[PDB]
N, CA and C atoms as an extended XYZ file, in Angstrom:
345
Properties=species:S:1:pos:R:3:atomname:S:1:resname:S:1:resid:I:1 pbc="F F F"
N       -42.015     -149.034     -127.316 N   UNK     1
C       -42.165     -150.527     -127.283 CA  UNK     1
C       -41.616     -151.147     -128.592 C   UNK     1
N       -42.076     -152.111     -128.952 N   UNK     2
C       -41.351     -153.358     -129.972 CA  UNK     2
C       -41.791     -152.658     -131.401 C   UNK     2
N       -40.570     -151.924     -131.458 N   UNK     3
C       -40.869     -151.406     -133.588 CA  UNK     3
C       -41.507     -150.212     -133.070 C   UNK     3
N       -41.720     -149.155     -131.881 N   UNK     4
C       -42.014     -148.255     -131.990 CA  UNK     4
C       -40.726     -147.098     -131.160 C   UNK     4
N       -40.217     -146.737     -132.692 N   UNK     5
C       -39.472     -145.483     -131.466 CA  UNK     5
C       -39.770     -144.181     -131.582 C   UNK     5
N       -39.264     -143.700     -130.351 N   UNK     6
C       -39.281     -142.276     -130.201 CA  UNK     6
C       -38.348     -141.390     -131.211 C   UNK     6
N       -38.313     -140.702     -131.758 N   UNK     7
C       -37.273     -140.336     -132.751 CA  UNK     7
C       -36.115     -140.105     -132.260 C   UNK     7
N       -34.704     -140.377     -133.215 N   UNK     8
C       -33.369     -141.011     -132.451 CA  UNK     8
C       -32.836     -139.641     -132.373 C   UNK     8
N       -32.793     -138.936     -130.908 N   UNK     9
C       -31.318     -137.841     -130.532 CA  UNK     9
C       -30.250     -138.570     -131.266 C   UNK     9
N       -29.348     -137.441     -131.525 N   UNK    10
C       -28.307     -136.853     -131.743 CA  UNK    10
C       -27.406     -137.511     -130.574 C   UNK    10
N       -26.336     -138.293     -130.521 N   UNK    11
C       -25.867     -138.516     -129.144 CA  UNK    11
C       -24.565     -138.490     -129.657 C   UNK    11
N       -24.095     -138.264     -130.894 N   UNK    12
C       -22.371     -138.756     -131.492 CA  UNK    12
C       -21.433     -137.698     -130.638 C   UNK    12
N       -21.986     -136.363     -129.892 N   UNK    13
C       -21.188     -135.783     -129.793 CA  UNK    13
C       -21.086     -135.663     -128.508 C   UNK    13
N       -21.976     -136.391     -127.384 N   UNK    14
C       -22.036     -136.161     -126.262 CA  UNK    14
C       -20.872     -136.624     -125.430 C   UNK    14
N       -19.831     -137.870     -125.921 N   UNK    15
C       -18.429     -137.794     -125.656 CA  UNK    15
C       -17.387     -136.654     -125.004 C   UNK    15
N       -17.365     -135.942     -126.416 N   UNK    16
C       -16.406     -134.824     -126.689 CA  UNK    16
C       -17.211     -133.319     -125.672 C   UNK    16
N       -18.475     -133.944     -125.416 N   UNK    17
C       -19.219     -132.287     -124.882 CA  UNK    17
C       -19.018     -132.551     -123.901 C   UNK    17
N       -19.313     -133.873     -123.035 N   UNK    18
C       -18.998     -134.329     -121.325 CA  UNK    18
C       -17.169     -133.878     -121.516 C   UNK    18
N       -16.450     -134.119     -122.397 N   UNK    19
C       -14.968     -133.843     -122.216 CA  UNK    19
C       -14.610     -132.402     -122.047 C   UNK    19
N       -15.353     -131.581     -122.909 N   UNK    20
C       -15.160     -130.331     -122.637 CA  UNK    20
C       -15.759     -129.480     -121.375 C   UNK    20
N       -16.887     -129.905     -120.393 N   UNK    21
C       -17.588     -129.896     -119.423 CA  UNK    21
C       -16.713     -130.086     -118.619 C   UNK    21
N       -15.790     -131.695     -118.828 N   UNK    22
C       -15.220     -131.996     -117.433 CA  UNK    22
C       -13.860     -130.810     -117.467 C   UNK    22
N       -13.564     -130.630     -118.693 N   UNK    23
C       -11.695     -129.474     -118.872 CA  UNK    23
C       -12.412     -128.114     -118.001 C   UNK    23
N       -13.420     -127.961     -118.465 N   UNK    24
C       -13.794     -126.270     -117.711 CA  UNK    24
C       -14.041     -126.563     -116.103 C   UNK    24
N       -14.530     -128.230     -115.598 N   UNK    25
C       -14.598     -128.103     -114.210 CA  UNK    25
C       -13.176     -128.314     -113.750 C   UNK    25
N       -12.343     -129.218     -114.371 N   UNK    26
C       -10.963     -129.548     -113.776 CA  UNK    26
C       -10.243     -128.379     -113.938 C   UNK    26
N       -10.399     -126.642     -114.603 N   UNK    27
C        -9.873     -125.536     -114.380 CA  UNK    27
C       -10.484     -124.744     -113.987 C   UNK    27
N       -11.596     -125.297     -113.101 N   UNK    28
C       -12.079     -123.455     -112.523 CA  UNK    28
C       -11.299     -123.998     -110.948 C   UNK    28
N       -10.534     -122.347     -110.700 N   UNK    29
C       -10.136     -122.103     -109.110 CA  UNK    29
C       -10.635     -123.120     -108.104 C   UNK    29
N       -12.022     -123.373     -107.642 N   UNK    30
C       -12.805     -124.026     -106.781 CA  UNK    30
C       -13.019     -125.393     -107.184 C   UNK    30
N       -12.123     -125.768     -108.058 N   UNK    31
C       -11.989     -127.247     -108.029 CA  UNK    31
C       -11.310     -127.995     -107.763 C   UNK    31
N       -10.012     -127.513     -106.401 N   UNK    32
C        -9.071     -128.330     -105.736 CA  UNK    32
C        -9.365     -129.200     -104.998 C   UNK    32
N       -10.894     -128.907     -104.226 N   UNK    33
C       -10.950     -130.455     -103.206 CA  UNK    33
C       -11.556     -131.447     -104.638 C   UNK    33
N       -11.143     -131.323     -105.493 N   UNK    34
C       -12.303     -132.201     -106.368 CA  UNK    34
C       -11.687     -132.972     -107.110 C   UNK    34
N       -10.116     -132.366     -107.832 N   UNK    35
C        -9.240     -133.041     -108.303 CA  UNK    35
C        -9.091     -134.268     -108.873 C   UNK    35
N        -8.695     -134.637     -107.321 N   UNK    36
C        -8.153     -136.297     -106.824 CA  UNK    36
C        -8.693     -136.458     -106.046 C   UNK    36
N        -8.590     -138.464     -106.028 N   UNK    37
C        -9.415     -138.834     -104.624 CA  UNK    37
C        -8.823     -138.203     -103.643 C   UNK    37
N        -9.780     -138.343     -102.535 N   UNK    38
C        -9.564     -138.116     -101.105 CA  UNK    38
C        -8.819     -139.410     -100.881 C   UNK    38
N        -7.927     -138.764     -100.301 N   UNK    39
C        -6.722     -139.774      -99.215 CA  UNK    39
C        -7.564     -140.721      -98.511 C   UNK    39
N        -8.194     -141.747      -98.467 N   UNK    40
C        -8.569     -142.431      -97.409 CA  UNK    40
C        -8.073     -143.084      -96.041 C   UNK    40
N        -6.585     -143.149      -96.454 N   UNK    41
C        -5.442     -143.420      -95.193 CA  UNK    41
C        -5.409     -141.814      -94.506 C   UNK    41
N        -5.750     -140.834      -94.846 N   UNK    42
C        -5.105     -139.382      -94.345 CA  UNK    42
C        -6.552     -138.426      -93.740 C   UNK    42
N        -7.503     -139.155      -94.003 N   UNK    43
C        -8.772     -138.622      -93.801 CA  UNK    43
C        -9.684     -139.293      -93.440 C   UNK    43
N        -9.995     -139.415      -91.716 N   UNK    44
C       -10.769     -139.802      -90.656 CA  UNK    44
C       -11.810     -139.827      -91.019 C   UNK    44
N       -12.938     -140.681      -91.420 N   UNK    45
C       -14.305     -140.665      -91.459 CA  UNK    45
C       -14.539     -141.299      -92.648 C   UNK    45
N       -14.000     -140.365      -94.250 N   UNK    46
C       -14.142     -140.803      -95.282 CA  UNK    46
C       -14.252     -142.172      -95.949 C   UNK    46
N       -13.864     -142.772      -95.675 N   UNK    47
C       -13.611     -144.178      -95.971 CA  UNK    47
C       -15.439     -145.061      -95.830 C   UNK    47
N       -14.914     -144.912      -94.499 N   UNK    48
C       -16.347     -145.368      -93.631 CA  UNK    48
C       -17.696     -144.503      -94.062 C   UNK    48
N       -17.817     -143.248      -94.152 N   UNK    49
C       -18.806     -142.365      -94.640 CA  UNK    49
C       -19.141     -142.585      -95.742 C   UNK    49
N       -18.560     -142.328      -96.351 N   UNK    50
C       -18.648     -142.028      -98.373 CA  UNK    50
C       -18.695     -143.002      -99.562 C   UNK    50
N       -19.689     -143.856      -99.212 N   UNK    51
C       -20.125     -144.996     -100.142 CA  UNK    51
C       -19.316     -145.019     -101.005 C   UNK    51
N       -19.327     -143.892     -101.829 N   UNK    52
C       -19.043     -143.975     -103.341 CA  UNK    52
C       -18.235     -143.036     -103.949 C   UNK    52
N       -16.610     -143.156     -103.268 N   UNK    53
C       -15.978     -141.386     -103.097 CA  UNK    53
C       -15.563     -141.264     -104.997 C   UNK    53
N       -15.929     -140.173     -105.605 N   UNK    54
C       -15.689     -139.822     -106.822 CA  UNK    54
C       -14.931     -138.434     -106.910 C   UNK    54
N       -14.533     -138.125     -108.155 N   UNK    55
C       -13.700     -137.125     -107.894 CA  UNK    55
C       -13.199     -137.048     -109.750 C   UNK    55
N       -12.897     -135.577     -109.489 N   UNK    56
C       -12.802     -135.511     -111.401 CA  UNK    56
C       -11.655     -136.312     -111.837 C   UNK    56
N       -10.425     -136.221     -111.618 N   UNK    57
C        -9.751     -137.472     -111.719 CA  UNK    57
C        -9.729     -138.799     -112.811 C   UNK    57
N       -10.967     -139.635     -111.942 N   UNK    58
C       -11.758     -140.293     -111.595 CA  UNK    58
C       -12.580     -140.300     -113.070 C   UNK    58
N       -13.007     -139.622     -113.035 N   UNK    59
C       -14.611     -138.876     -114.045 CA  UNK    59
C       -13.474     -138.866     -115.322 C   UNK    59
N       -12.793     -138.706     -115.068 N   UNK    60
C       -11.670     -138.130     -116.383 CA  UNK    60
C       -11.401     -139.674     -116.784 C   UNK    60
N       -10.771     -140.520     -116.053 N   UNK    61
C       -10.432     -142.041     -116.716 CA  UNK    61
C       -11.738     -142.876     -117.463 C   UNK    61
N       -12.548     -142.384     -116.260 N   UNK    62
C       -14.203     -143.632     -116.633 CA  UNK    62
C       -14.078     -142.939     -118.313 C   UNK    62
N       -14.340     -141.672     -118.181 N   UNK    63
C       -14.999     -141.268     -119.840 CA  UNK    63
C       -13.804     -141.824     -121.000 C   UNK    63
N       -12.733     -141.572     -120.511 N   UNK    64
C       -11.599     -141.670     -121.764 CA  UNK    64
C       -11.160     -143.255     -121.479 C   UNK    64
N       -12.080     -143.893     -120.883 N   UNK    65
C       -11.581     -145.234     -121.148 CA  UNK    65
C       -13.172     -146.332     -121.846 C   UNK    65
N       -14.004     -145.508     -121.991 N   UNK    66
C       -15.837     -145.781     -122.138 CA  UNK    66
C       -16.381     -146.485     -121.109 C   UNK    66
N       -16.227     -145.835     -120.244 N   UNK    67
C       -16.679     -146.283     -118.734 CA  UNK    67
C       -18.061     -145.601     -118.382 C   UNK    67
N       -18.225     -144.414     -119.206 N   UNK    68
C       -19.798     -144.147     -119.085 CA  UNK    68
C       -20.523     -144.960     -120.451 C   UNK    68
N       -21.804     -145.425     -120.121 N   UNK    69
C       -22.553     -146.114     -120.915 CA  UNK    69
C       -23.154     -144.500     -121.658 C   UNK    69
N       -23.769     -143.745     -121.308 N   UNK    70
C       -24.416     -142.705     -121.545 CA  UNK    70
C       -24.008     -141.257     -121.000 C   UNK    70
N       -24.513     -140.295     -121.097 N   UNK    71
C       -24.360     -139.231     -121.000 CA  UNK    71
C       -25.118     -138.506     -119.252 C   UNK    71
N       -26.410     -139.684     -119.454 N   UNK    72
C       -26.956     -139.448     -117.744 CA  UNK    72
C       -25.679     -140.123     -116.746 C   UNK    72
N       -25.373     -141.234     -117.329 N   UNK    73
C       -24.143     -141.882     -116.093 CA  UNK    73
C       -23.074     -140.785     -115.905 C   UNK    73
N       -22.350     -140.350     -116.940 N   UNK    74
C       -21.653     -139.014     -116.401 CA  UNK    74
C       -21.925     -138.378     -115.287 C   UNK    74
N       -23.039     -137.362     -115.954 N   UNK    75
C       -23.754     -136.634     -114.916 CA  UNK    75
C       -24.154     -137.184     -113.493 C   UNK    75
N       -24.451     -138.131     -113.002 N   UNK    76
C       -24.485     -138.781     -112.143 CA  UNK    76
C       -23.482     -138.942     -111.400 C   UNK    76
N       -22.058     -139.009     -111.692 N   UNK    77
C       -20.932     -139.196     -111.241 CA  UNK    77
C       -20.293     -137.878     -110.757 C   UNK    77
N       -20.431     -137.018     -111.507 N   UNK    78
C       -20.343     -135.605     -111.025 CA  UNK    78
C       -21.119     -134.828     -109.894 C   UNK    78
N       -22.396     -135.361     -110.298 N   UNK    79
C       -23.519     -134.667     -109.329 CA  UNK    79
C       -22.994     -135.561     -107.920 C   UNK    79
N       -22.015     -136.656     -108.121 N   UNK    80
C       -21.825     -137.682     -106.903 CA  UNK    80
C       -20.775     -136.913     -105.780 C   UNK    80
N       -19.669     -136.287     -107.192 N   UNK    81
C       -18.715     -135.371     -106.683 CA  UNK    81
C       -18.689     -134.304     -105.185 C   UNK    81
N       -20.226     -133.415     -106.009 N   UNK    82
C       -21.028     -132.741     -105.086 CA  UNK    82
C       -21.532     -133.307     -103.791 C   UNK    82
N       -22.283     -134.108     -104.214 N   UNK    83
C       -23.551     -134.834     -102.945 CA  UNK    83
C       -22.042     -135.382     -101.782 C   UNK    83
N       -21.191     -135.699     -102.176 N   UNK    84
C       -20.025     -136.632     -101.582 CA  UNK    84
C       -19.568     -135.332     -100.523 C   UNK    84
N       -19.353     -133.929     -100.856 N   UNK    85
C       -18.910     -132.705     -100.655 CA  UNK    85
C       -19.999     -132.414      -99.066 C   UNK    85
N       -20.920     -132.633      -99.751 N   UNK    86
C       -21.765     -131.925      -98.857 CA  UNK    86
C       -22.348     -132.811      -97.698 C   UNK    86
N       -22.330     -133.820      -97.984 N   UNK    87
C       -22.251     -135.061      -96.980 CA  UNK    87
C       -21.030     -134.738      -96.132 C   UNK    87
N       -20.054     -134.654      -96.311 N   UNK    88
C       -18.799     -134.325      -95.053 CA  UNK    88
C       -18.051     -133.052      -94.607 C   UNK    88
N       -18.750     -131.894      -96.054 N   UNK    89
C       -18.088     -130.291      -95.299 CA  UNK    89
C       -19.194     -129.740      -95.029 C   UNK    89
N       -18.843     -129.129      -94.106 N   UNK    90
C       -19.899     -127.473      -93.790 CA  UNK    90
C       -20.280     -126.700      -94.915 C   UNK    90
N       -21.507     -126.759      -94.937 N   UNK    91
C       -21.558     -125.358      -96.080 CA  UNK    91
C       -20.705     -124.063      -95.346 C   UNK    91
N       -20.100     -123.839      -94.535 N   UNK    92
C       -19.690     -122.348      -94.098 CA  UNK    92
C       -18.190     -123.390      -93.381 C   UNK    92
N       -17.447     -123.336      -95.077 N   UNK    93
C       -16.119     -124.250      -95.121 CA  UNK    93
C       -15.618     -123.944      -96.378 C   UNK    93
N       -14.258     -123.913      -97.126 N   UNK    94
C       -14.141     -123.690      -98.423 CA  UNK    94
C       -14.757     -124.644      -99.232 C   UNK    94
N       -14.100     -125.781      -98.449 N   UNK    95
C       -14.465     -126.600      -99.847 CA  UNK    95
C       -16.076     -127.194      -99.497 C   UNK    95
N       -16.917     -126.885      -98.745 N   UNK    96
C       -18.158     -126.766      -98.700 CA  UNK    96
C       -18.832     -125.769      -99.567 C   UNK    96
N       -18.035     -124.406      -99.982 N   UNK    97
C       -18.396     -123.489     -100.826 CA  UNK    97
C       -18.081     -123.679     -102.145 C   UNK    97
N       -17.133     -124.453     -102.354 N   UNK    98
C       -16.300     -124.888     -103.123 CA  UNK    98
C       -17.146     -125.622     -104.255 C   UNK    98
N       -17.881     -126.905     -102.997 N   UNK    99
C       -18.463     -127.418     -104.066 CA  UNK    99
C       -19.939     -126.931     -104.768 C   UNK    99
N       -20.834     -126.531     -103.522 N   UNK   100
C       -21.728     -125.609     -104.117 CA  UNK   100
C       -21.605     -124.740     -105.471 C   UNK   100
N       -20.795     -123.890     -105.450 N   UNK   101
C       -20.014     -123.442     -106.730 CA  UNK   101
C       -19.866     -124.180     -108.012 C   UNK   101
N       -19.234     -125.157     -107.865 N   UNK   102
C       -18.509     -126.435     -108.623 CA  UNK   102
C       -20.221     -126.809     -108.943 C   UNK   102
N       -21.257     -126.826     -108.163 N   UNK   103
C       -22.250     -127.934     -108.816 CA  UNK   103
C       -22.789     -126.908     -109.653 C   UNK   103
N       -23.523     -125.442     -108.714 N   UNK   104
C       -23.985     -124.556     -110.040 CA  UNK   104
C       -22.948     -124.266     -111.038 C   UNK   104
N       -22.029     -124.401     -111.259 N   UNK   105
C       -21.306     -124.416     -112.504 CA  UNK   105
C       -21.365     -125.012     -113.351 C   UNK   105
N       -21.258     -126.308     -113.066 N   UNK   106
C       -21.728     -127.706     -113.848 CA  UNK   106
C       -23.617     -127.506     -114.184 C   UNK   106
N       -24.205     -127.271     -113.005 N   UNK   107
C       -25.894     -127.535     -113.787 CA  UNK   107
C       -25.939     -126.744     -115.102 C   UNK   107
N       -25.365     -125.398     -114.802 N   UNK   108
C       -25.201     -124.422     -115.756 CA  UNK   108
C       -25.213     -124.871     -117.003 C   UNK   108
N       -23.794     -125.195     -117.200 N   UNK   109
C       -22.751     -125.775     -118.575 CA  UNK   109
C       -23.499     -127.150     -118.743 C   UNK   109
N       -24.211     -127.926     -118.461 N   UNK   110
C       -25.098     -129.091     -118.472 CA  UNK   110
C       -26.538     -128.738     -119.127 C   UNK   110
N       -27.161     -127.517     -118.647 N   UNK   111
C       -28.358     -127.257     -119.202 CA  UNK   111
C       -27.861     -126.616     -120.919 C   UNK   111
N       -27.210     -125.850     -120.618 N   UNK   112
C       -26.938     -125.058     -121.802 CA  UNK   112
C       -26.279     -125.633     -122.870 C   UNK   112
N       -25.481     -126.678     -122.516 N   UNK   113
C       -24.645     -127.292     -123.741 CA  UNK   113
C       -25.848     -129.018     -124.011 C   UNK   113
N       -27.052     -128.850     -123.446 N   UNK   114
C       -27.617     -130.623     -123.719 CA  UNK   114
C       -29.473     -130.051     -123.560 C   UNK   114
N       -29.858     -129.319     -122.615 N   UNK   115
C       -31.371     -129.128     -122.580 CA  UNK   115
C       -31.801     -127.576     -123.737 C   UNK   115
């Protein structure tokens, strides 16, 4: 509350750590459906389905332009990546496996480089 804080994290570096997070997801193998947006002219459903289609890309401009306020908004956008994945593939699909993969990869490199 007013004149009482919690003691101030460390946040100067959380920039450069979401940047290095996003380089290891934009090069692991299982991150081709994740890239770039989805085609919305080339792909039936998407458009109409997928509220909020995100994609590393995407994740890559917001951060290097200060489009995340914080370090949870990141994460949020990524975890969107996923949820977006699994909303329209099969888990027993590549890129249904794909992203499963892609998210425990990320919780991983998320716990270990911030909790």
């Amino acid at each position: 509350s007013m004149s009482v804080k919690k003691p101030k994290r460390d946040d100067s570096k959380d920039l450069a750590l979401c940047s290095m997070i996003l380089t290891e997801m934009e090069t692991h193998e299982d991150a081709w459906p994740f890239l770039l947006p989805v085609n919305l002219k080339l792909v039936p459903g998407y458009k109409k389905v997928i509220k909020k289609p995100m994609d590393f890309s995407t994740i890559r401009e917001k951060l290097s332009s200060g489009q995340y306020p914080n370090l949870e908004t990141f994460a949020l956008d990524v975890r969107l990546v996923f949820d977006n994945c699994e909303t329209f593939n099969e888990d027993d699909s590549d890129i249904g496996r794909a992203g499963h993969n892609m998210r425990k990869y990320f919780e991983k490199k998320w716990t270990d480089t911030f909790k």
